[PDB]
Swiss-Prot record, chain B:
It comes from the Bacteria. Sn-glycerol 1-phosphate binds at residues 15, 158-163, 188, 208-209. Prenyltransferase that catalyzes in vivo the transfer of the heptaprenyl moiety of heptaprenyl pyrophosphate (HepPP; 35 carbon atoms) to the C3 hydroxyl of sn-glycerol-1-phosphate (G1P), producing heptaprenylglyceryl phosphate (HepGP). This reaction is an ether-bond-formation step in the biosynthesis of archaea-type G1P-based membrane lipids found in Bacillales. HAMAP family: GGGP_HepGP_synthase. This is Heptaprenylglyceryl phosphate synthase. Its cofactor is Mg(2+). It is an enzyme of class 2 (transferase). Its EC number is 2.5.1.n9. NCBIfam families: GGGP-family, PRK04169.1-1, PRK04169.1-3, PRK04169.1-4.
Amino acid sequence: AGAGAMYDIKKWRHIFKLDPAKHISDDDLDAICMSQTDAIMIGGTDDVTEDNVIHLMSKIRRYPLPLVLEISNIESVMPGFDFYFVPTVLNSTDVAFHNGTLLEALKTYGHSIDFEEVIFEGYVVCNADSKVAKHTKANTDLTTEDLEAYAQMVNHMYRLPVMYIEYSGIYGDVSKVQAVSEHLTETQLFYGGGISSEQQATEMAAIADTIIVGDIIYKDIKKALKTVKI
Amino acid sequence: AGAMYDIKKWRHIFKLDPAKHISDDDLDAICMSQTDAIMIGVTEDNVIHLMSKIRRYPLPLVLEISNIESVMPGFDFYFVPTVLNSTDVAFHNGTLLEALKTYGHSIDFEEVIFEGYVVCNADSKVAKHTKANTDLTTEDLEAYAQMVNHMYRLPVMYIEYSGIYGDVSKVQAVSEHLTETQLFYGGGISSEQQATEMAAIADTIIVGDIIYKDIKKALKTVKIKES
């Protein structure tokens, strides 16, 4: 990620994350895209395809806010996004999710990538009962110490621009997010999982630099909208 | 302070395997050579002795930490490998996670240099040990070079051919994608000819085995051309 790209992204506090495998009505998408969120991120687990990413991105391009793709696989990578976020799932037991899939993507597209718009994210999946934990083969048996060690790894050795604490499916352990933040300095802390109110949004946004809100969008659009009130 | 501790200026490093034997005379010869640093790759007692001798000379002494048992004070820098083409997460960051849980409170990270390794010799011990994918085409290596330089943005990419001399066109292809990341090359350098050919591509060559096989040839490996 370039210095200008991180200057812009460091200002973001709230991102609405859309799963292209899910359907979202025009009314709901319009409410999301016209809201006070800082950016829309397309991301999913399995079932992220060229067709469904194309279909969703085409509807979102009708709006001016930043649109980013969290790359899930090679098939769905495509031009047109403002930034590309690439997870390396640090607690995955499978190298495909560390850099194996990335390697294949770089072989295919490396010739023409603008790496200043690519943000490599150190991702730690923390909820066992989630499609992302199952999909990424994550080891979720993690203690606060494990998380602090991953935070030191990301901030001091890899020095990645973003560490993403992912609790997809439930509201996370606030003390753990706090513990991780104490080790992050130049790396931004993104947190996602279970946020469905102004209060949960505010609580996690007081610790993380940027909160990611996703599932609530499909369950209660008005509750989703309250999450931008940080 | 000085060019001496600036890793970006180093062109040649003699790498010692503390499990191997080296005479005091041969060690002094290495230490008084124009190499830029000595790198040691828990046989702790030979290591403490080894360090005591090298410290009689004004040259950087660094430790490459291979396992959690390698942890140890007294070095100028601590180089930590991540084997990017390993098929086992322990060698990407699993072992590193355990080491940080144990020692992360006591480490000064400014002295730690993370090395993005690509192990290239199928018939080597490290490849077997790390379960490395060594079926690398030039395109595979170019993609790992982009990954290290642009995504992980590590300070060092280390191409390791272990006991054999590698493929110059592949090391060349790699070098073309590296800008801020320094290229270390190690593998079978046993002559001034080989040292010179690789040092014209890599930023720093690492010379190890020849030290134990023929000290005279090893000493000739410091004769390279200007960068």
